[PDB]
Design a protein around this ligand. Sequence first.
Ligand code: CA
Ligand code: CA
Ligand code: CA
Ligand code: CA
Ligand code: ZN
Ligand code: ZN
Lengths: 535, 535
Amino acid sequence: TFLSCSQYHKMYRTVKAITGRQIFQPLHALRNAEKVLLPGYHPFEWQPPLKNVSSRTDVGIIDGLSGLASSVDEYPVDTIAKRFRYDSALVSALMDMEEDILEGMRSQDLDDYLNGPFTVVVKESCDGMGDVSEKHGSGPAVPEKAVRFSFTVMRITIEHGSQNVKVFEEPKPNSELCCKPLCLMLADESDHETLTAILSPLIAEREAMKSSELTLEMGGIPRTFKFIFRGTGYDEKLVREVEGLEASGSVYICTLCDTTRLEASQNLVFHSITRSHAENLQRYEVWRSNPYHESVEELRDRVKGVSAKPFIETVPSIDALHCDIGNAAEFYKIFQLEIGEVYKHPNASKEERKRWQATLDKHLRKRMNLKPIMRMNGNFARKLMTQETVDAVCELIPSEERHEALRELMDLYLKMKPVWRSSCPAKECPESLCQYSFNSQRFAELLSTKFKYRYEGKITNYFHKTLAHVPEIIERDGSIGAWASEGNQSGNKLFRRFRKMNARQSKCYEMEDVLKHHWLYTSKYLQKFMNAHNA
Amino acid sequence: TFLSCSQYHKMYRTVKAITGRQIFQPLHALRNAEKVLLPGYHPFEWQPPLKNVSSRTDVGIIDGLSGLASSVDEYPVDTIAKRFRYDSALVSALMDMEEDILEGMRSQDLDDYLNGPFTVVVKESCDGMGDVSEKHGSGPAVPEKAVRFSFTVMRITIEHGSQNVKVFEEPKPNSELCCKPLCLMLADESDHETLTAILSPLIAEREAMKSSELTLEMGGIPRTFKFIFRGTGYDEKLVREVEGLEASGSVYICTLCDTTRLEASQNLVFHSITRSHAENLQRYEVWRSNPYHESVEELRDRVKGVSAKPFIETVPSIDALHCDIGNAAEFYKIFQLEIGEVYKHPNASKEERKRWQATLDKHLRKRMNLKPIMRMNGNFARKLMTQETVDAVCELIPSEERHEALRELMDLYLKMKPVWRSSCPAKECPESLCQYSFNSQRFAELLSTKFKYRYEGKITNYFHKTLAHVPEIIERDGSIGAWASEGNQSGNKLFRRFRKMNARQSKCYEMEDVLKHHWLYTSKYLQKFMNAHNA
DNA sequence: CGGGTTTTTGTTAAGGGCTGTATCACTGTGTAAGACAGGCCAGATC
DNA sequence: GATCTGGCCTGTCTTACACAGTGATACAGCCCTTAACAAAAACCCG
DNA sequence: CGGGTTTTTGTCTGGCTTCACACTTGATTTGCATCACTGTGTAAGACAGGCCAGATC
DNA sequence: GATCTGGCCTGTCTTACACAGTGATGCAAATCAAGTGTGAAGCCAGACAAAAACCCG
Ligand SMILES: [Ca+2]
Ligand SMILES: [Ca+2]
Ligand SMILES: [Ca+2]
Ligand SMILES: [Ca+2]
Ligand SMILES: [Zn+2]
Ligand SMILES: [Zn+2]
């Protein structure tokens, strides 16, 4: 309930004074009871020991700069960052769901006196949250950004007998309160130097603890764990910045295959995900050495766009949220243009377009109760992509050809959305799952012909993604929308709320408190209570 | 505790689910007990019936605009305003403190079943609190102001037998929890037209209920109330504007007497109070009519600087908060002046001055660690009026005579301050009061002799108020601290809080809700619970 | 009113774990009108 | 054209406009053992 | 391993309490669901035409 | 002088960067208002007699 400290004291003391009894507990008896949910309280043993990692088990908050020498003689740094160690945070994530994993193995008809080598499957995400300042006193504010690195326990399993049996899955994967924060900093997502400085220790630990066994007593017997990390919450901009690729508006578009933007337009859907991470490392090495002595052009053509040392590891996937939003904006543009009726007469001035936009806005508002926006909301997208909107727009297009065109377009888009939309299309919507190939293919066919006036050259990349990489990702990784960033993006409001109402205003502790509160919020043994009214 | 209407529901359902038996009441049963405290719930009748005031007893939150016709053909008015009536607010303010007045009646050895002609003393106040907006869209350069008109009950007195008795007195008058709001609006405090248009009905009701009696049952049997209204919580700018004088830069300074600065600076302290409200009004009349057929330059002098129609009967008296802050900044500037020792070499330019300021601020931050601030706050003002800091600056400054000429002046100021800083100095410091004559005339003589290089012409206003009036205003009214605006001012913060934790986002309920919550907060039948742990 | 019951009352003392307020370090900014006073001056008038 | 101004331009000086709220830390009471000596309003038959 | 020796059991009839279980039909609290409303144009970066200033022939 | 070209300059298009939370109204479903006559249950009153952890063998 985002209460402060003094407020809680007021409520407690007055309840006690009135009703005689003592329902709520005092403060010190609350600190001494939260010290059991932050990291670095439990005992744990790595084996074999972790290279380059300390062995102590008393590591709570630690400084994000990781001991970066900051004097007037070196590269100036002026950021703030706080973080948990990876291993301690991970063991706390485990000891905050001991009860759930026990209930799981019980329901699955197993023995609780079992300490088989469970395998965890984690999801990692990192999205900037710029413009989180506010005016202090009475005046303006300064545009300072921020970045938060966080993960999510997603699927715990165990190989009993001969096959693996699933013991725990997340109910709502990309929810607002099951992405647990791990590090946060007041930096920018493009200040590559500072970003790498802060995220180098975390990636070092994440690589180190990938060939070991963690041991800790899990309610009685001691139990062992392996790990499998799958970084997916990265949006297109990040995944295109860190992993090594060039900027966003390149000629090489898809971060999974390697085809020129033009070449995507000729052949739409027959490609194959062909971009690992070690491949990016060796390609950057080729770019650096240049063993064949080619000019910059032929070189960049050979290495397929990569021109920087891949700094992090990231699996190739589709950020469902931004993908849907981009498709929606794409359809908005095609509606504007179709009001333009430019397929007959092209290349108008940059006033007819403004007129088309304004009349489209007024019309759709007065017919569907939709106020005009530019920064498109996901809600705005869901409200726009409705067959009713197509029917309301079709009056402003003269001919039946455009009628049937827009009709078929929206119909196929809504027959393809559920596949990459649901959280497990393997069972929840298998019909579109088995139709998706033919569906997307005919969609592409009528997109090339009926609209060649627009998609004859440049085709925006998200279309290529939605068209030629969704079936393979499905077959590879089960769900799609499960591994999305929306599980994190919603945390921005929590960040701002905490920073406003729970902090100490020192720019140094001022992140310890925010991170601690976020961790506490996102626990599970602490929500099993707030969900009590479900008897 | 500034909870919401849904967070409270969270707390309620979780407590009820955990401990079985409910400990917090539901929401509907909270609102049904909310109604019994908002104004407009009880019967009450006037004797004689108030002319121009309705007779109903079920008026809640009335639109402040007072049915102001706002059609494009008329004056464009766009502010928002909400209010109570005045009687329906006084009634509730009395009937919540029913128990606290009956207890006083008991303690003062009086037959409980008494229904004498009670008399209430009500202090009225008003002060603009601009810069309330927020750049929710992250776009700066958009200000907005607000105004709150509020009152306070301060003494309830009955005339038993031969004399009167203090059935009730206020513990801490100028605090933020015993000043009740009455109306509020979104308009610049100097937008004279809108201000009058909104505040006229209140003065109508106030002048109506000044020659009547309110009959109302008070704990069983009925009792009769009559009122007295003293308007005192007005800063300098308001009392200068609404009472109809020339602005603060005038040659005429004192809102209580009629003397020009170039005359009070010579006749130091022998004045009185001779500027009432009816005198002010008839003087505006003789201005407007101009019966003597005399030019403007001497007419202005004849009417002692009145040039507008005053529309609020307000009693004149020195404020406390702003007076102390003014004196503080005043002798801070005299410190900065004494750095340059300009008495020896005069007429320096405006760069030596900035250097003097920088030196003073740095020396003070090194010695007494007084932070640097542009807009002085009462905390700073108290921090700077110390013998320690004047001794530090005295050790910075070169010469010696300045040591006497500043330290003795400062200790005179400190010997003077409490008789007005206090809250009931009629008996708390009944010695400094009787010495105030000497204690102030010595200040006067020394400012006239060892500092006449500044105070030969222009003397600031507050240094005239403190000098000439307070030893008479004490005998006139009583306290000088209790009749101050510290209370309402402190309330300002609360506004913003409620505004973005309790509001329905309609710009027409965003003031209903704020007013209602502020009312509930500032009750007394509620704080009687939050003070349980004490008793 | 009172000596001795009638059921109690400090109290005051030797040290120790639990509670409940009082601090502690630490941050938010240079304005916006209005009145009066000289100084400069650029056309007014003899 | 000299000598005047009132018109304008600066050019200061006055009053307003935020420091109170956050988590952590630090002390002061405040119950807990016996224990005896004194102390104590309340009241009966004296 | 065992018999006999403890902390603690099955039931003996019976007399004095609380508690519920019915079925009675409306007068109420309590729990969710829903309602109207209220935030602004990018900001870096890749690529392509087209002038045109200035090199060449 | 004629002609190609590299550099500058716009101009276009790609990914990005904020809307859930506020009080209130309104149905809809459990809950109680006093009703009464019966279980029915329990409290065990020491006593008499057997069930499972422990000294003497
Ligand atoms: Ca992003
Ligand atoms: Ca984002
Ligand atoms: Ca003011
Ligand atoms: Ca104020
Ligand atoms: Zn691709
Ligand atoms: Zn005066």
